[PDB]
Design a protein around this ligand. Structure first.
Ligand code: 6LF
Length: 269
């Protein structure tokens, strides 16, 4: 439709699609082989992920999709986020090219390598948490947010780099109380979800509030109850979870303070 952005346009001729990766609600994501995404070398053929409208399309699907593409242009590169590589708006159907995370999302990454009984050593788990904290701090600094913030929304590269998916200016067990009841989202509500994700990591991909149907959960939070410390999880990291789950948002740590705490934990080597 419109227009041509020379900072981002990529010719479809050097883009052969491949097997689907997953969906959706905004668009199908396929694996794809791209030729010459790094123009220092017109030969090196690296893989990417490509986002497209599925086809009984919209009228609320192309709208946010192009809105999604414009948002990623403005934030720019960061190591701990799914970066935008190029776009194809010149010959018909819209393609959005992004970095490929070979190992799927964080929750699948953890559960697939789970032990059978009583790889994912302690520093790797801290490494995952530190990286996601680094990504969320950057997003907040660009006055952008990510309300969802579950392990299923963090992708893992071939090199165990954590990259947050989705960017912009019913998953009820991850949501801070004010976003759950008052329906208001802040940077401090993001920190609540990070605590839940912290717990997702050190249970190696467990389900939050296990055995609890999602309803009465609000009463237990009102009663001051939080999830217990997972086994073999050190009390320092459970202390951070409890700080992320403090009822008052101003009593919660900011993403800066969570990066320093996790950094001090990684430095223990
Ligand atoms: C809907 C999908 O969006 C994206 C967006 C950018 C991406 N860059 N790279 C991948 C690789 C996906 C993959 C590679 N292996 N596997 C099997 C793993 O079980 C899945 C990928 C997926 C998604 C998925 Cl597929 C998963 N979680 C979150 C999201 Cl948003």
């Amino acid at each position: 439709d419109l227009p041509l952005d020379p900072l981002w346009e990529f010719p479809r001729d050097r883009l052969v699609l491949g097997k689907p990766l997953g969906e959706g609600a905004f668009g199908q994501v396929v694996r794809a082989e791209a030729f010459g995404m790094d123009p220092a070398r017109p030969d090196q053929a690296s893989t990417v992920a490509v986002k497209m409208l599925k086809d009984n399309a919209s009228d609320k699907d192309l709208a946010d999709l192009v809105s999604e593409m414009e948002v990623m242009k403005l934030i720019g590169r960061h190591k701990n986020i799914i970066n935008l590589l190029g776009v194809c708006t010149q010959e018909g159907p819209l393609y959005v090219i992004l970095e490929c995370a070979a190992k799927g999302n964080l929750r699948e990454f953890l559960r697939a390598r789970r032990p059978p009984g009583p790889p994912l050593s302690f520093p790797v788990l801290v490494s995952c948490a530190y990286q996601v904290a680094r990504g969320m701090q950057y997003l907040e600094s660009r006055k952008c947010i990510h309300r969802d913030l579950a392990a299923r929304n963090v992708l893992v590269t071939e090199d165990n780099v954590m990259k947050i998916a989705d960017f912009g200016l019913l998953p009820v067990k991850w949501m801070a109380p004010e976003a759950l009841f008052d329906r208001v989202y802040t940077h401090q509500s993001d920190v609540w979800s990070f605590g839940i994700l912290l717990w997702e990591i050190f249970t190696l991909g467990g389900s939050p509030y296990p055995g609890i149907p999602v309803e009465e959960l609000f009463s237990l939070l009102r009663e001051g109850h939080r999830m217990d410390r997972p086994p073999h999880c050190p009390p320092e990291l459970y202390g951070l979870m409890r700080e992320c789950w403090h009822a008052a948002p101003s009593q919660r740590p900011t993403f800066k303070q969570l990066v320093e705490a996790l950094d001090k934990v990684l430095l223990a080597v």
